Structure 1
Amino acid sequence: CGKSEAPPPAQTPEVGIVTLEAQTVTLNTELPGRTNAFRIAEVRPQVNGIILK
């Protein structure tokens, strides 16, 4: 008639303690853009006439 079920306690192990200290780090930032030629010349004529060749 009842009078049972003794509760045991727990220990809860396996905690991952990791410490941290100050440091010196450099900061960067990504910026989007395009690539362009170093020098590009569009060939344009300076006379009048028919392209023969």
Structure 2
Amino acid sequence: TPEVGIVTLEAQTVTLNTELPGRTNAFRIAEVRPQVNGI
């Protein structure tokens, strides 16, 4: 007979994190637009 490595598995609890793509946006961005005219 052969002797092979055998595991004994049981129940446990997991968390199930899911991977999702995306980009990072800045928190408080302010494009400096002039509000007044001239050179």
* TM-score over 0.5 (shorter chain): yes
Structure 2, unaligned runs of 5 or more = none
- Structure 1, unpaired ranges of 5+: 1-11
TM-score scaled by length of structure 2: 0.80
TM-score by length of 1: 0.63
Bigger CA radius of gyration: 1
User: Kindly, what percent of the aligned residue pairs are identical?
Assistant: 100
Runs (4+) of structure 1 moved beyond 6 Å?
A: none
CA RMSD of the aligned region, Å?
1.1
